[PDB]
From a paper:
The ion channel class of serotonin receptors (5-HT3AR) are cation selective and belong to the super family of pentameric ligand-gated ion channels (pLGICs). The 5-HT3AR pentameric complex is ~250 KDa in molecular weight and is made up of five homologous subunits A (5-HT3A) or a heterologous combination of subunit A with other subunits (B–E) arranged around a pseudo five-fold symmetric axis. At the structural level, 5-HT3AR is a dynamic allosteric protein where binding of the neurotransmitter serotonin in the N-terminal extracellular domain (ECD) elicits a conformational change leading to pore opening within the transmembrane domain (TMD). In addition to these two domains, the channel has a large intracellular domain (ICD) formed by the region between the transmembrane M3 and M4 helices.
The cryo-EM structure of apo-5-HT3AR at 4.3 Å resolution is similar to the 5-HT3AR crystal structure but is captured in a distinct state with differences in the ECD, TMD, and the ICD conformations. An alignment of the two structures reveals an expansion of all the three domains in apo-5-HT3AR resulting from a radial outward twist of the ECD outer β-sheet and an iris-like movement of the TM helices and the ICD. In addition, Loop C, which is at the periphery of the neurotransmitter binding pocket, in the apo-5-HT3AR structure is placed outward in an open or “extended” conformation. Further down, the pore at Leu9′ is constricted to ~2.3 Å which is too small to allow a hydrated Na+35 to pass through and in addition the hydrophobicity of this region prevents ion dehydration. The intracellular end is lined by two rings of negative charges at positions Glu-1′ and Asp-4′ which are involved in governing charge selectivity and constitute the selectivity filter. This suggests that the channel in this conformation is non-conducting and the Leu9′ position acts as a gate impeding ion permeation. The ICD reveals a notable constriction to 2.1 Å at the level of Arg416 with a strong density (6 σ) at the center of the pore axis, which we modeled as a Cl−. At the edge of the TMD–ICD interface, there is a density present in the cavity lined by M3 of one subunit and M1 and M4 helices of the neighboring subunit. This density was partially modeled as a phospholipid based on putative polar contacts with neighboring Arg sidechains (Arg306 in M3 and Arg435 in M4). The mouse 5-HT3AR has three N-glycosylation sites at positions Asn82, Asn148, and Asn164, and strong densities for glycans were observed at each of the asparagine sidechains. Based on these distances, the pore radii at this location (>hydrated Na+ ion radius), and the B-factors for the modeled ions and waters, we suggest that these densities likely correspond to ions and water. The cryo-EM structure of apo-5-HT3AR determined in the solution state, in the absence of inhibitors, Fab fragments, truncation, or constraints from crystal lattice, bears the hallmarks of the resting conformation.
Numbering used by the authors:
A (entry chain A), B (entry chain E), C (entry chain D), D (entry chain C), E (entry chain B): 6 to 338, 397 to 462
The structure:
């Protein structure tokens, strides 16, 4: 029986007089240089209404003290050892974009070496407010800024450095949960110096993460209802307006766009500066089919069984030949005296009815020619609108 | 051998018989004059249904006690030193408007000086109540209350002061996230007094904060749908009511306006005094399309193939010389005796049918003139209300 | 060097052997009385589906112990002193209607006096269940119950009293947050006693809070939509049913009334005893428009070109000659054989068509007369129901 | 000066050498007997989508101690004494159905007797997972298992016993919050000895709580729109299909059932066993009005100006002579040669129009007889199905 | 007298100089192996949008100690003993894929043996992020991962092993709550060796849990409404398009299917991969009723009183007789001269009307033949799509 019980001789030796209130150095003029390694793991939820961001990052620590040194000689060759966190000095590195306390797993153990180098592997999910931008909403990048800093100390007590090469944290192809909502290309760290006056300067440092959304599910959620609405009203332009159900088709598909516009408004607020640049594509298409049903009401107004004023020849000998010669399909197009008064009144009434019928035939013929030319012009206009859509999307296939 | 271990000697010297429970003074009659300072950082969310405000500010504290003092000589000339917070005296400054406990990240270290001055850097989230005004809804100036006061001690024990000039916190345009939803005009602190009875007076000192909404999301949300509904029904009056699908147009758009009034009800609540002035614009425009539906149902009632009483000349020859020529165009308009009874029996029915046709022509002509004049009057009324609305709205845009 | 550092001498004197677990008295047969002070500060959230009430109360405590007495004179005229709460005896008073732990900020300081009285200002959030009855839906009053009691103590251990006069807490119109949803008329404290058996008797005292909903924020959207639906269908009765768009207006507003019932159903439920009987007005209004479209289908069935027989004479003579005078001004409704046979064959067909036209004229004339009759009857019923509704609203303009 | 300050001498005699970690027995072969009393307060929310149940329990814990016995006489006759809970032995009575830790107000005090028993009046809220059944939807009864057990101890350590008779638990006339969603029938406790291994036997026992719904909101709320849809299409079968708006009425109420069916899609869940039987009664009456719009499209297909010939004799003797008679009222019904060539085409065209008019009269007469007989058969069918649903709800409602 | 109180002597013996900070062996070079025993209890919530998994598991631990040993001799042969968890060594191993810390029930008691092994029965409610797939939406398998790992320690101190056979945890069908949203098939554990560099390795161990959906709720919520509104339009193809209500019927249930396609984006998949397999059967169905609307407007455009010429015989003798012969049965279709001259214009007008009527008869005859042939072709296409759908669905249902 000798005086070698276990490896708890170190906890008997240097865990009796050491406390956590005082800063473990000898000369107070030399700062405690700390190092930061950031391995991002996953993001959870983006938000622009409350301007808040939720993420989950791994967190490494590297500092060096002076009260926790002993020799590897005659302590049974021990080098590293676990020690609880509530008995050593703990710094206060935190971002200054807090909105709430993030619930983090509480690990109780940290490292210590024989020369004074410690390790602190602990996880934390930080909730944060950051800058947002939606000026190109399906093709977006977010220049967000995380700022590790000391909330209460200065340059002279804690200096934040980085432990490894900045290329190794810029080229971080490490463990990241894919198949989510977003991607990242690279992570850009930067050291920064910030003073506010003489002899009160704090140790800030900046991060620049950039986040990139997949334009895949939002395409199948938003884009194609516009394109089959365009297919169905291009195919539904073709009914003749002499019945009256064409304006019924117009009011029912504008009611369809109305309920679709109620259901699509709950995508992004962008209440501050952000203009819905994708909403311009909606509103110019809505303007063109608004003037389409305006000319629908116009051509229903012109073509009707009215028995009114005769059509003018100036738009009959000039306007008709201008719209037929350029289009492909045009076509060409006493007792015996009482018997005479009766049949004369009968033939006068019948020729008046036949004249009104031929005038109404002329009205519907002019309306049909106008409908055909407007069919050609409107298909040319929607094909120009489709190629205007395509000529903006054709750049970003390679980017 | 020098006996000097570290700067731990000062902490082990003064933390021997010090307790955090007692209020640290030498004379108990002199009040501990404390000083506070406000660094506003962020606002989070509003709710006018529950009358609650959620924000996030940075916060500072200042006091001077008479037990945290020693000589700055012969201790390696140290001036400031970190100390834990749960071993010294902590005040209880709080607001009188708590509805919930905001989760706040603690800072386990505070400063001390050689003459007894301290420093307390800690943030804490403010979930508070605020009397909100909803009379002028899009152009709203608000006025909340953040009463930083004590909870037990009076003026004779704890007196609160400021730290810097009130102009420097009135023009506080420090670190503050932009691109949110509200700006601030100024922050106005003022020191007051409030005693409920004799020998009891607390330290009340308000912080009047003023926020202002950005009227940009509500415009693109619900202002222009009204104006293209206006261009739709203005260009959609123009179909003739002789068919009957104009009634279908009118029922479909008041169904659309009704369902858009349905969905917008559970979007923006306002329950302080009642309905805002924005609902005046809703009630006048629904009155406009109600009287529009009244006139359409009136002109469908007047113009119909009815075979009823002849049109009166007192509204025929009068209205052609009162409205038409003054506003519209001048578009004014046994072999014989037993055999010839069949022609009489035919011509009686023919002249009856022709007379009913000419009377129905007169009915539709009077209806066309009334439709034209009411269309012109309604367009003038809409233009007058539009120029009135823009000449009452164009003031707030020019500062 | 006198033997007085500070007032820490008392804080080390009577905190040397004072325990925190035993109830501080001299004899165990003497109950210690406590006091009750309740300030109805503000409400947070009401609910009837989960049956939970959430509010915040400024609350005070008062009791008297016998171990904390010392003389003021010879201890430098000290009367009051702050002391931590985790070193003294704390009672366990709490209501027995909790559903959740309300987050409340802790208060680490209480008073102490030299005669032995203490003073505890301790707020706590009330999230709790209560008896709610919302039978009278717009004009309601709730007799909710709060039951202050000890959890395990008896009358023989402690006792519950009230501090000031009960009139001063009954008329306690203190600091109260207005401009929300619920007012505060009065509260009613009442001391009771609930002894369940012999030698196990508990001490309780009640609070019957009286709160009243504002009939302004929901009354708008639950009253005037029905009002302009009434003005819409009253102005929409005007068209004749001969065109076929009156049934279109009828199906359109029944679809609007149905989707209005869809949006209004999920507002406030009542599942056990209380009924939605403010919707008895809703069920009589839907009975009104159901019988309205029923007589619409009836008059479309009676009036149509269906080619039926001559109508009933006795119901025609009493309607056209009598009932019209009741309701309005009445309205006063080989050559001999081979030649004439063709004229007679044309004449029989023409006179058959003319007789069918005159019979159909009689059909829609009787239809118009009956339309005017039940139109006047239904407008009399609508004005009677409207004056009944406004006088039943006018009962409650008393207090 | 007598040697008694207060009754603190017993606490000084007990709490000097008593550790809370050891199990308070004199021999390890004697298990401790505990007692269970359950008085349930109220249940809050049911959700079978997550299969979760939330309730609040007033429960008691009675166990027996062997280290805290002393004599009452010569210690001033004191019997019942308060003691904190964090200084004595606390068991681990938990259930094996926790999915979320319920927030509970901790009672810091318990009693102690001089015979050797203590009691703990401790609450905790339960967030439990239960097996739910939604087969019989309105009059449902559920069967949940609150299996009280020890999570780590065995029969050789503890033993779960009862305190009073289980008939007084089954006859629980105590405090229960009425006016909610559910109600109580009975509470049935049951002991169940359960072992899993050799010499590894735990202490289980069962609770089978019984709850019953009061169908006063959901029943009438999903009963009213179906029944006025029934009265609406009963009173709306009666308009004639000759106009063309009867199919507009039918598409209107099928769109109404579309929006009512999609608003009822967000209701109580399924897939525990399958769909409830309340959807079978929905889908069969939807199938019968599918047959109703099928016969509308049948009677519109048959009755139309299609320009065909006379119908087959065997079909018109069965439709206009059989079903119009034996089921209802019998609704019976040089120049002389030049003019010889004239008028022949006129009389041929007039007799062609006359025979087409008479054939079309036969068409809509057969259609009217079919409409009348289908009206009779459809009223009999909906009356039979309605009285069947009424009697199958009426016998099943009784007990 | 024997001064042996109880079994508290062994607790006072081994809990005298034992510390929970240092690791509990004598030779530090031997890693203490730990064992893992997992039985999953129930899952709570799945979320493909934020990619998070929520479940509740039962959990066990086993390790070997050298400082908590004693002898069974002369201590009343005691083996089972309770000891608090906050006074012994606790490992730090946890899941590498946490997001949020869930509230877990606290079990402060653990067993201890005399040889040096202990029990640890603690539960935990974990919140993890796992890989999901949304390709096969009704019948999916989820190869998830629950990686147990050491967050802070290496191989040289701890070592994660198993406890029982992997077949007994592979066929683990113990106490589990059925009748939920999912159901599990098997749990596949696997040992894993991870060496990131030289002399720094971690002890990971994998869990490949397998869960499978029962398509009962989403089937009855999704697939049969498509079935019966396709029943509605295949029974609604019956009417001829001459009335003008066939287009209105078609666009009405087109709007119904469109708003049901709007509302089906509530429980749809997320941005993980892209379009699900169920979206193909929806887009081909909307293509079917869009081309149905296209042939509807085509047959309305062809058959209308447009006042055009006779149809061309190039497509009349061949195409119209094709579907009449190779398909079912067809239908085989003194002024002497100045007095009688007032009939030529009359007979010309009547024969012109008769010729236009016969041409329009030819128009709707060709339209009726085209309607019948397209009815046959479309029912053949619907039956082919239905037999393709059931021969694709019959494979996965049989399994
Ligand atoms: C440990 O728990 C036991 C049950 O939770 C508790 O009850 C005891 O149960 C046994 C088994 O039934 C008894 O049985 C009696 O057996 C008779 C036949 O010999 C029969 O006629 C009776 O009806 C009973 O079933 C015990 O009598 C019963 N104990 C009591 C007090 O009722 C044990 O008591 C409990 N042990 C301890 C030490 O608390
Ligand atoms: C609940 O389940 C238990 C299972 O043992 C059974 O004994 C009991 O009868 C059930 N309750 C009812 C009301 O059927």
């Amino acid at each position: 029986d000798t005086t070698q019980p276990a490896l708890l001789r170190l906890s008997d030796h240097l865990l009796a007089n050491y406390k956590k209130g005082v800063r473990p150095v000898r000369d107070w003029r030399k700062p405690t240089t700390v190092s930061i390694d950031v391995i991002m793991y996953a993001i959870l939820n983006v938000d622009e209404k409350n301007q808040v961001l939720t993420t989950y990052i791994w967190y490494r620590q590297y500092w060096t003290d002076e009260f926790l040194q002993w020799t590897p000689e005659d302590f049974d060759n021990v080098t590293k050892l676990s020690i609880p966190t509530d008995s050593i000095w703990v710094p206060d590195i935190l971002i200054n974009e807090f909105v709430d306390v993030g619930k983090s797993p509480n690990i109780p153990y940290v490292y210590v070496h024989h020369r004074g180098e410690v390790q602190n592997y602990k996880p934390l999910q930080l909730v944060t407010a950051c800058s947002l931008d939606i000026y190109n909403f399906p093709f977006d990048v977010q220049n967000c800024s995380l700022t590790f800093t000391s909330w209460l100390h200065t340059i002279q007590d804690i200096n934040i450095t980085l432990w490894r090469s900045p290329e190794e944290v810029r080229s971080d192809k490490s463990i990241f949960i894919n198949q989510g909502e977003w991607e990242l290309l690279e992570v850009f760290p930067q050291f920064k110096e910030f003073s506010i006056d003489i002899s009160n300067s704090y140790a800030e440092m900046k991060f620049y993460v950039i986040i990139r959304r997949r334009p895949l599910f939002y395409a199948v959620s938003l884009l194609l209802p516009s394109i089959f609405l365009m297919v169905v009203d291009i195919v539904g332009f073709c009914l003749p307006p002499d019945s009256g159900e064409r304006v019924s088709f117009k009011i029912t598909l504008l009611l369809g766009y109305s309920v679709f516009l109620i259901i699509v408004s709950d995508t992004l607020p962008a209440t501050a500066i952000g203009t819905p640049l994708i909403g311009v594509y909606f509103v110019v298409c809505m303007a063109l089919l608004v003037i389409s049903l305006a000319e629908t009401i116009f051509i229903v107004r012109l073509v009707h069984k009215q028995d009114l004023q005769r059509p003018v020849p100036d738009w009959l000998r000039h306007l008709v030949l201008d719209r037929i010669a350029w289009i492909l399909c045009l076509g060409e197009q006493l007792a015996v005296r009482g018997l005479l008064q009766e049949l004369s009144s009968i033939r006068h009434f019948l020729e008046k009815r036949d004249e009104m019928r031929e005038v109404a035939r002329d009205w519907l013929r002019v309306g049909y020619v106008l409908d055909r030319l407007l069919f050609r012009i409107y298909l040319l206009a929607v094909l120009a609108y489709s190629i205007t859509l395509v000529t903006l999307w054709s750049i970003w296939h390679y980017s």
